[PDB]
Amino acid sequence: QNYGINLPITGSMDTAYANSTQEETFLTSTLCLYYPTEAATEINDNSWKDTLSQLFLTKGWPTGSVYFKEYTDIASFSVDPQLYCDYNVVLMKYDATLQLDMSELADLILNEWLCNPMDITLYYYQQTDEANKWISMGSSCTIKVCPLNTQTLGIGCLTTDTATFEEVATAEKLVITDVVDGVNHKLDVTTATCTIRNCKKLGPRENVAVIQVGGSDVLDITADPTTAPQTERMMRINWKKWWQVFYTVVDYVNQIIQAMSKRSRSLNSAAFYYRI
């Protein structure tokens, strides 16, 4: 495939449509439903996974295809999220106090990322392009940035005295930092508690859809202030009970998968591609 990636593909605009491949897609794929712990707590049933699997089977998914992964909350799930199967549907409970954290998690799991290690103890770092960010995650991230000049002298911050650096995060389980491009920055990070990587946004992630439970349209998966795209994979629903949410997810699974594309799944479940 690779040697012919840089080759044209020609198609006639009168080629008959193939039959629906949705049945074959379900019979050969695997679905993961990521829900918060409060969902299973409020459902208060131990066999609900079996019921949901049977309902999915009624909807065409063979038994064994659908998987259910639990996460405590948005913050914990953001610590190196793992996307396991072909189709990942993430139910994210909305909280008006965690808009930026929801935005960061959606940005991380709805886009492809190519990350490299950042030895902040040794080297200064730059964000070369608008697609370049610094993604840091772990138990607690606290990132302090000191912009430098051509002579390495910090601007509004002494290089030695970290206390005069500029705070961009505090005790974050995940943060995507965006500094001015072309300026070398000295970084102070709680490396013992969390890891920071220099990442590049390759493009969208088709196998991951995020359903925001309750709330309003608040996700901003792009750092650009002028753009706040609402892609087809960013759903939003209103809720009073979680059984209704899960029935809505099952009943409209065809529509949800339609909003997602195949071949986007990676061998590894990691949220980014790491190069060291």
Partner: protein, 396 residues
Amino acid sequence: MDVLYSLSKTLKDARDKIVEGTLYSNVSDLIQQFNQMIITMNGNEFQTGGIGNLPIRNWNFDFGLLGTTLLNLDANYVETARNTIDYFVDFVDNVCMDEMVRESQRNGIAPQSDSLRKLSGIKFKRINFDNSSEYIENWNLQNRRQRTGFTFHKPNIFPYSASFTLNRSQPAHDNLMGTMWLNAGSEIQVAGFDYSCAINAPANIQQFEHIVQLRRVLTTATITLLPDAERFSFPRVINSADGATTWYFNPVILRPNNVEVEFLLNGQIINTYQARFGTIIARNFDTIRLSFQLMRPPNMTPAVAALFPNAQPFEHHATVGLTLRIESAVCESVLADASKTMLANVTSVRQEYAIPVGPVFPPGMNWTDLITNYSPSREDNLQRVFTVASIRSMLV
């Protein structure tokens, strides 16, 4: 062919000029030619064939000569002439139809029907006179290895093809770069689309190229070139190359940049037009090379800047189009065109009598297949049948 054309021409002249009350001096030479035709054809038995549902017809010629002693033609003279002319015209129409429905892999240029083969004998060569029609003129030139010329208004030179090529593509078909084109009869509507609007392209420019290889060389061609392809300027849902899915096209039209139309002959650039639109002349060519560019506008008003973000999703897709229309041309070979009726006549005759598909032409005389594989044998057969059809159209 020349004898059949001469028969048709003599009959047409007789129908047009042998009229009640006309001076005999208006038709003296015509009457001599007509009487020579009668003498030559008298005593000969002809058969037009039973190929397909075309009925077998037997033709016998025993006619009196037209008179000469009158000063002005009267009713009797005109009725006698009309009777003879009607029989002869029916014979010529049937011979033309018989020849039109026939094809030979080898001697496609040579006559195929028994009647036309008999007319190619020496005893009928005396019937031959003025060969002035364009088709018979080119037929005689082609019998002598001379440069032929057929003038076509809107020649049907491009086989139908509504196709697209993607240079950048993904399974999701949301960041695409490629070209769409329709090559209709005399039309080339091409459009290069970039979904990213050349945000990441070197120099903020995306090059698009379209090459149309004509199956025959066109000369003295008039071409109208316009900077927009209206056919690819509205939203479309388009099948993928394999047909396994559909993708969404939502063009926003930008002015094509660095438009260069090259008309090439045997790989050599004969004509070149840069940033020219309207009427242009391609004097001799067999290949068209349309190169254009989508240039991202460096200065954008807030709405334009809103259309084109720095990254995905791309909801508005930049498109630059060209339209090429050959209004007139000259070709050494026969072609269908918007003005003549030769292809229509041959196809109609073949369809009306249920002529089974032969070894030369495609089924149903489909023009797209015929021009896609316009081989020398097909060229010979097609010129033969088109010349016969032009002969027949003189009378029918």
